[PDB]
């Protein structure tokens, strides 16, 4: 919440933000497939 590794050297600190945004997007796209395959569609079939 309040650490050095969060407010870095330059005021810009844009490269770290973009790297984190990339990692977050990768995780979100993987999670879409994971959740769709594990529980969403087995439930959707019964509801249909």
């Amino acid at each position: 919440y309040l650490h050095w590794d969060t407010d870095l050297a330059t005021n810009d600190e844009d490269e770290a933000y973009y790297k984190a945004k990339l990692d977050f997007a990768i995780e979100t796209y993987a999670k879409i497939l994971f959740n769709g395959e594990v529980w969403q569609e087995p439930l959707a079939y019964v509801q249909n």
Partner: protein, 48 residues
């Protein structure tokens, strides 16, 4: 130029973007866990 630089560089120290990214990621995890739990409850209710 110096006046504007001071004014904007001071304001760019109030906020820390990496904390806000961390909170966004936590909110996403909360959302998907929430829909998993809601599916559990709806499934149990229909089963009963």
């Amino acid at each position: 130029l110096r006046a504007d630089s001071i004014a904007k560089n001071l304001e760019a120290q109030k906020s820390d973007v990496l904390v806000r990214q961390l909170f966004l990621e936590r909110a996403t995890a909360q959302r998907d866990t929430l829909r998993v739990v809601e599916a559990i409850f709806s499934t149990s209710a229909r089963y009963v």
